[PDB]
RNA sequence: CGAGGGCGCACCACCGGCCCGUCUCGCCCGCCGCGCCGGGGAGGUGGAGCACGAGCGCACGUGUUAGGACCCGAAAGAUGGUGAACUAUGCCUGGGCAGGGCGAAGCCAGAGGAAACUCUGGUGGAGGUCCGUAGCGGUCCUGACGUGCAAAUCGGUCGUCCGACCUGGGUAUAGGGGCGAAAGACUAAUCGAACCAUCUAGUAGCUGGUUCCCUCCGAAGUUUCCCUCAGGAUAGCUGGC
RNA sequence: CUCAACCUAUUCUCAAACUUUAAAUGGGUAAGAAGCCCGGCUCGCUGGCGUGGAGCCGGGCGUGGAAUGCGAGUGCCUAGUGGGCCACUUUUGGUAAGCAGAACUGGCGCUGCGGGAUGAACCGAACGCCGGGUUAAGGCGCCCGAUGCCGACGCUCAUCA
RNA sequence: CGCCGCAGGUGCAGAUCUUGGUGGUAGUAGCAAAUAUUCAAACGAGAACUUUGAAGGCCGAAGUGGAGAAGGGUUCCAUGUGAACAGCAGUUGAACAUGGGUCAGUCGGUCCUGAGAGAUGGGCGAGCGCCGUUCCGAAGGGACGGGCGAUGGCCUCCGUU
RNA sequence: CGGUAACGCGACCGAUCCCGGAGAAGCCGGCGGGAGCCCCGGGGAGAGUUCUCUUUUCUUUGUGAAGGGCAGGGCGCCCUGGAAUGGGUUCGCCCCGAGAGAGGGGCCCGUGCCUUGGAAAGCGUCGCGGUUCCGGCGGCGUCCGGUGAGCUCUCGCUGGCCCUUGAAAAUCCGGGGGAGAGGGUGUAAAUCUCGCGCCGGGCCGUACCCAUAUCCGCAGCAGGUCUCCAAGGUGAACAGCCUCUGGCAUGUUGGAACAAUGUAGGUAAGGGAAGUCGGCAAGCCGGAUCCGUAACUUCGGGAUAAGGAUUGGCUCUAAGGG
RNA sequence: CAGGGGAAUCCGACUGUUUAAUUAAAACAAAGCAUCGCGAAGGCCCGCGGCGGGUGUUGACGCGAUGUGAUUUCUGCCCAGUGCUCUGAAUGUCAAAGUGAAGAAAUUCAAUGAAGCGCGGGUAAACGGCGGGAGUAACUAUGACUCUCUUAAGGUAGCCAAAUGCCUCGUCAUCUAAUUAGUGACGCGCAUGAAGGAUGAACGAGAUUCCCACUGUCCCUACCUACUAUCCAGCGAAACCACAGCCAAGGGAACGGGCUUGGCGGAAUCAGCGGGGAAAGAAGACCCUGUUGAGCUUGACUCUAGUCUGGCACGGUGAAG
RNA sequence: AGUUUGACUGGGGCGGUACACCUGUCAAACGGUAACGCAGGUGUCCUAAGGCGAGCUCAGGGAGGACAGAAACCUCCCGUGGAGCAGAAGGGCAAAAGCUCGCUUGAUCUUGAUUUUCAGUACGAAUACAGACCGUGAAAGCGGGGCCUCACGAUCCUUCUGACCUUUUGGGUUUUAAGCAGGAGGUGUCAGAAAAGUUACCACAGGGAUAACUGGCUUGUGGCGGCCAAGCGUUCAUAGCGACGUCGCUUUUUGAUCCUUCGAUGUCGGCUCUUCCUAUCAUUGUGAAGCAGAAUUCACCAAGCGUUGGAUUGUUCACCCACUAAUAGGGAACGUGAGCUGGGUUUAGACCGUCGUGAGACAGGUUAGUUUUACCCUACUGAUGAUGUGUUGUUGCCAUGGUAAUCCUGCUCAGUACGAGAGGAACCGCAGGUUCAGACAUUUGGUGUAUGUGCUUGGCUGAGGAGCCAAUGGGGCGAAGCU
């Protein structure tokens, strides 16, 4: 008859990320005439981290083409980039680690680092440390581009999303044991407030529908429906199998 | 006074009669509408009826009932609000934690070896490291106290004491909600659903109470029915007129 | 020749759910005037018939047709109750029970009083406030009213009467 | 107040009844956590407790020391009083009464932003309103610079509009 | 305007605009500089002891901010030059043909010293006048040294840790650029972050307590309630115990006794858990030095395993420095 | 000032946390292991409502949801059941709307066929389950071996009278003089067992057994100290109270202070004491009843937010089939 | 989210249905009559097993007859029903009510009255009629279901059937709908809600109407006795026993019941302590023996005195070790929690096994889990006192009450009596011990703040000396007193 924990995670209060150090949102710099038509040089100033995140980031400065400052971007750091490096962000860039570029200008086996969903926003795809996306395929005709994703996945994206050229820095950061339940609280603190998490045979059935019984035991199958309502979909969701994978 | 005889009130029992419904049988009658029209009879039977009215209004008593309903009494339910000054958790910005033990990597030198390399002594000062203060906690005495110093305290003994550490202030989360390293814990001495006001004099077949005198009469705990078995209706037993 | 079965005549012992016979106590009815006896009339019922039955109309009969006691009939409104318990006797279950369950009458509940030392129910008796007399059941050594009778006849000795 | 009528918020021993008062208990339990007091004097009606002096002790710098934050709000400081209060007393008091006391350019607030809170535009909403914080806004009211001019005046010439 | 340079000089024209800096950063370790405190040796002043001794013991013995100069510390700053037979160097490290060592400079901090302030004040002493209760007057003094793994602050250098990287914004400054401005050689102009001078800084808070009696717990309640300063001895020590500065009056009463029962603290012959559900409670052990340590093990531990010896006082002797 | 020590068994790896006010633990957490969902028109979740909001200043080495619980070592069999999931394969059923027919219409009938459910695959580190029955070896006994039945498989590796074994104080060994205790062992184990089983250092205010040392725990008690109690001066409550307060027996609501019969009975008191007052504290929390609830669960009955699906509207322009 | 999750009940749950009915009995000769009384039955079956008429006689047995036998068919005789009538049982029935045939649909359409249960309500079932229309039989008649006693169902809603029926809202026609009358679809908790759990996290109103502990009744069961005497006892009923039977007692067992207590009587065991009982283990005094002695057994008077130390276990019980004269059994609210303890059971945390889908459960195991108050009355223990003898004191008496001692060992008797031997006593006497009691401190031991005197750490008084502080600084020895 109580709010289960994951139901009181969306209403947001005491479940937020834990933004106060980050640096800024991680982003490539808005598609404009350079980039659409030729390319851009900015040059690495700095290569930071950024608190609740694995990846380096990297502090990138351009010209403004239309008026005399220097602009800042904050883009996610492909692993090789230094600081005092030349980035060049265009249609016209070049096949180096560290530049932008469109997809569909590229070869097709090449890898990429930020990888834009849709063509205009800034990268969406493989941002997570040590993460790539494959470029696989070309389709001049309806400007399309197949490309695999850090999951295995296929998908077809416009022939103009740009990406960073090669995979970003951080390395196999899990490969790592944490070993230490304080490592794993220092880990969490920084990102948001899920760490220490409770075991639902180890409730109540007020606030779990696995809680309860005079052993802990689920009780019922913990594979549950898809179109469970929220406070009973818990366990195992939609899972299409269980058990141990042996053979894929 | 009077055997007999007569008219017989009210009321009672019975037999007839009449009105409406409904059955059975049956032959007639009526006409500015001749009809799938209208009326009539006899014999049963259903009616809270008729058969020379008794009602209406007012007052009083008793009984039943709806209402706060003889008085006091739930556990609950609903609506709208007030709280994170305690505590729980996240965030922000500050403050704090004797003295010792062990001796991780890195480094120096020496010695042994044909080499490969090994051994030895130092140096170094790691660690959710150890002993142990302050702090934080609260194991046992099942100690003290138990109308207490105290609506949870005190004594000794204890756990931890560089970390998932302790703590001030500022912030955020509000009741079927929050928050929970999870005990249904905590959420202002209140938590298996806070507190405040109202709906509300909530309902109670259950418990308690129910205020002057004399006189007269005087019981039942049984029948039948009931989601009936601590209660009712019903008949009985009672009193009054 | 013996042991069985079978039959016949006998013999012992029984029955809440066996019975020929069959009480006591018990249940119903009757013991008149709404009766009895005469005539007559009605009927669509019944029918050999003036039949049968019923109804109705007149008339005559009082020794008021056992005992005992008592004044009856009738209507309306109606409270409380709807936990009962006990005793003689009958009686079911149970080893039994101050157990559980029935029948009949009385009682306690609702009830005091005399007696049972004491006691809801046993025995006597039911109650306005008193005086005198007399009893019931029960008693009469002393408590404690009354045997302080020259009471009658026996029985009995108990170092748990 | 009696009598004749009328009308009731009309009669109490109880409700772990309501409010108020009062007993026994009972001059009882008790005034026992953190070592500790003593001598003399003064004031005074009055001294175990006040003040001074002397002595003996304790806190032992992680204090029973010296200063702040929060909170309190005059408790601060003199003078006086001896009602009540300071669970014994008091000549003492954080009590009572009467007066007095807090002085800033440079100590803070004030200013800034933080986690966050919150209008407007917009959106929703029966509605009080609430969602949202850059999102779906014509969101810059400013500027030494230059020009057009009014010469407002110590109209030379620079400040003004 | 000066210096090869690091950079220096008292100013050192310049807007819109652009760039940057400061504000602006965690925890821990180890070293080094500075201060305050502590300690040691003398010299003064005042006290204490003097039964005997003690040239004795105690107290006290200043220089704010802001300027100026000089030490001291730091530098990932410059110039010369070119290093292996490598050298320099730290407690640790670490550094070097991307320029070591060496020599010579530059900058930053300078809370230390001297100086202006400044002795006139303050303090300690010794006296003399009174203005019932004079910032009175007067004399004398306010001196010289030494130590340090000492304590506490502070400044710096260099490390370690992090799947943790430890604010923001007001506000202030520097630079790049050069739109413009200012005068015709005048006792000059624009301009000036240089020296001095003139005026102003409003509003609110400010007492006291800050706790075994000023707060919360119904109270003068053994509870709770955030901080800063921090002496001597012993000692490893912010331990415990004693003391100085400062504070207090035993925690809302006293007196007289010293029964039981209690609460708190001890001891106990011989035995040694036989007590009890159960070694509960108490007791044993304990510091440091020197030896010596098993099974097992994830090879790190176990480990202060277990077990044994020693420990005072006094008088010396060696060794360890500048 | 200032550790008693040793040999083991169980549990949990450790450090950490926890029921403020009876439970500090073996419980929770943990790293490690494993599984599931999700490529953003998304997953999970909030929201009365807005293309609102949290994760998210995020992007699969990430978020979200679960289980187990360090290391080491293994993690067996079963997809019948219940879940979950996958493609619809002629396909069964299946609402509204729409279509067709009859009728004068209301209406009726028929055709058509969305999800879902059925049918079919997958899935146990999903929930869970892992029994029987016969036959069978040259002493007997067992059964390596062969067939079966419910039906999906029949308990593998291990471990054990275990914190899990009723019988049970199991049997054997060992520890003791004596052991329902302990340890080792056995195992047809009422009813052990594999994401949990079995091990294994270090650790633990965790549960247990023994030994050394130590002692007032005890034999078996004594004495001492401080504060009380005690007496005094001052001050001064509360709980509780039908009336009260000596017993034996009787009868009685079956355990009397009162009543009956007997024993008997002497003011006012002080310090103790714990036998009684079925002493006080609280309208028994156990148990039952009530057509009194509440917390929680579930194919109980009846619903509902949210979700999946069909239809109508916003909702338009061209082609092919 | 809301709600529900029956009742009865020798507590409740589980089990049953005594919840609607029928038969016999209980039941006490009218009728009625209870318990979770006894023995049983029912939720159906039947176009005939209904209705008439006719004709037959059944069960069983005996005697015969080819196969044919203990049972196949046929015949005769006996046959009061001993068969059958659907079923449970009871009643009833013979040219029946049974069996076989023939014809049939009275198992139909109607109104009332009545009986049964009963309130004289309903339903169901039934009886006697009356009015139709029929069946059968020659007819009298008989028949509106079953030979009789059971075999079943309201309101509301639905469905069907019937009247050339009524209404359908301003009138008319036609659909439709609503009525009136009679059937059916059902409520088995059967006078008739629509209904799953759990709670140890629990709550409330109550209940001694009702369980768990004491007490009371009872005494099956437990325990302890007796009577008879078949047998055992080499023989021999009774030294010692006691089969088959039978009579008792006890309330330390466990049941049975539910009278007291639910506005609470603190619920196991142990520890501590007192008293009581005797059904006597030992000890005193005795009697009997299959008593030679020693040992043992039975019984009497008898409860004065005693009945122990430990391992395991929470245990009560149990079992073992060991000592002993003996290691008897019991009661007192299963004595004794304002006496203690808290190991057990019996709250909330948690683990396992089993059960359950789950929440959760388990007289299954395991671990951790607050034990409050006396100052009142009495009782008891001690302490003052009080009434009376004029005041007061000394010395006394004893009414009454209490009461206390206990057991063992060794020497001697005595290697004696007795006995074949092995063995092996007793009385008197002597010396000592155990348990208990009452004292006491000369001695030994304990205590020790005489704070007595040395020693000693840290600090403090300038040092010496003398001291002090550290909640008794520590430690050695220690008088007195207590013990
Ligand atoms: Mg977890
Ligand atoms: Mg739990
Ligand atoms: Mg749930
Ligand atoms: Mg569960
Ligand atoms: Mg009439
Ligand atoms: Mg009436
Ligand atoms: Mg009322
Ligand atoms: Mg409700
Ligand atoms: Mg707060
Ligand atoms: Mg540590
Ligand atoms: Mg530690
Ligand atoms: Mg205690
Ligand atoms: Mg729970
Ligand atoms: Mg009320
Ligand atoms: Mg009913
Ligand atoms: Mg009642
Ligand atoms: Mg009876
Ligand atoms: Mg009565
Ligand atoms: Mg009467
Ligand atoms: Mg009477
Ligand atoms: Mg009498
Ligand atoms: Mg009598
Ligand atoms: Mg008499
Ligand atoms: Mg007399
Ligand atoms: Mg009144
Ligand atoms: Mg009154
Ligand atoms: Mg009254
Ligand atoms: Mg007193
Ligand atoms: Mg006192
Ligand atoms: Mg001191
Ligand atoms: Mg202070
Ligand atoms: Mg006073
Ligand atoms: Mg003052
Ligand atoms: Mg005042
Ligand atoms: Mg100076
Ligand atoms: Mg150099
Ligand atoms: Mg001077
Ligand atoms: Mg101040
Ligand atoms: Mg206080
Ligand atoms: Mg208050
Ligand atoms: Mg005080
Ligand atoms: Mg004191
Ligand atoms: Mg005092
Ligand atoms: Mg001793
Ligand atoms: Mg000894
Ligand atoms: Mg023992
Ligand atoms: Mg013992
Ligand atoms: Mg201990
Ligand atoms: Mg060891
Ligand atoms: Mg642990
Ligand atoms: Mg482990
Ligand atoms: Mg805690
Ligand atoms: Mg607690
Ligand atoms: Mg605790
Ligand atoms: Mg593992
Ligand atoms: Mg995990
Ligand atoms: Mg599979
Ligand atoms: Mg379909
Ligand atoms: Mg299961
Ligand atoms: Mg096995
Ligand atoms: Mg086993
Ligand atoms: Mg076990
Ligand atoms: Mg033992
Ligand atoms: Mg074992
Ligand atoms: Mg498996
Ligand atoms: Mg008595
Ligand atoms: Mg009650
Ligand atoms: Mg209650
Ligand atoms: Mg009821
Ligand atoms: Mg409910
Ligand atoms: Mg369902
Ligand atoms: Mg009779
Ligand atoms: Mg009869
Ligand atoms: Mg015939
Ligand atoms: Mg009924
Ligand atoms: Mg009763
Ligand atoms: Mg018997
Ligand atoms: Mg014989
Ligand atoms: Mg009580
Ligand atoms: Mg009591
Ligand atoms: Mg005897
Ligand atoms: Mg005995
Ligand atoms: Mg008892
Ligand atoms: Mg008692
Ligand atoms: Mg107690
Ligand atoms: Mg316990
Ligand atoms: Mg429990
Ligand atoms: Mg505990
Ligand atoms: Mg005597
Ligand atoms: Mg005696
Ligand atoms: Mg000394
Ligand atoms: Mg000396
Ligand atoms: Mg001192």
């Keep these: 008859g109580r709010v289960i924990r994951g139901q009181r995670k969306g209403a947001g209060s005491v479940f937020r990320a834990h933004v106060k150090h980050r640096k800024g949102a991680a982003r490539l710099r808005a598609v404009d005439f350079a980039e659409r038509h030729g390319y851009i040089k900015g040059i690495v100033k700095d290569i930071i981290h950024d608190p609740g995140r694995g990846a380096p980031l990297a502090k990138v400065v351009f010209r403004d083409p239309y008026r005399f400052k220097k602009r800042t971007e904050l883009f996610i750091a492909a692993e090789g980039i230094h600081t005092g490096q030349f980035v060049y962000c265009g249609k016209k860039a070049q096949?180096?680690?560290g530049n932008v570029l469109p997809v569909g200008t590229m070869p097709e086996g090449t890898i990429v680092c930020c990888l834009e969903e849709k063509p205009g926003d800034r990268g969406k795809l493989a941002r997570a440390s040590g993460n790539y996306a494959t470029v696989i395929s070309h389709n001049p005709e309806t400007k399309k581009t197949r490309v695999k994703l850090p999951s295995g996945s296929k998908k077809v994206i416009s022939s103009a999303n740009r990406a960073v050229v090669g995979v970003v820095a951080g390395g196999g950061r899990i490969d790592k044991p944490?070993?230490?339940?304080?490592?794993?609280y220092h880990k969490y603190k920084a990102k948001r407030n899920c760490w220490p998490r409770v075991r639902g045979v180890?409730?109540?059935?007020?606030e779990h529908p696995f809680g309860g019984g005079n052993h802990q035991h689920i009780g019922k199958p913990s594979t549950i429906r898809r179109d469970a309502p929220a406070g009973r979909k818990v366990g195992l969701i939609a899972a299409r199998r269980t058990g141990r994978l042996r053979g894929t």
């Design 95 to 97: 096949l180096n680690i």
């Design 178 to 184: 944490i070993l230490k339940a304080g490592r794993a």
């Design 202 to 206: 180890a409730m109540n059935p007020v």
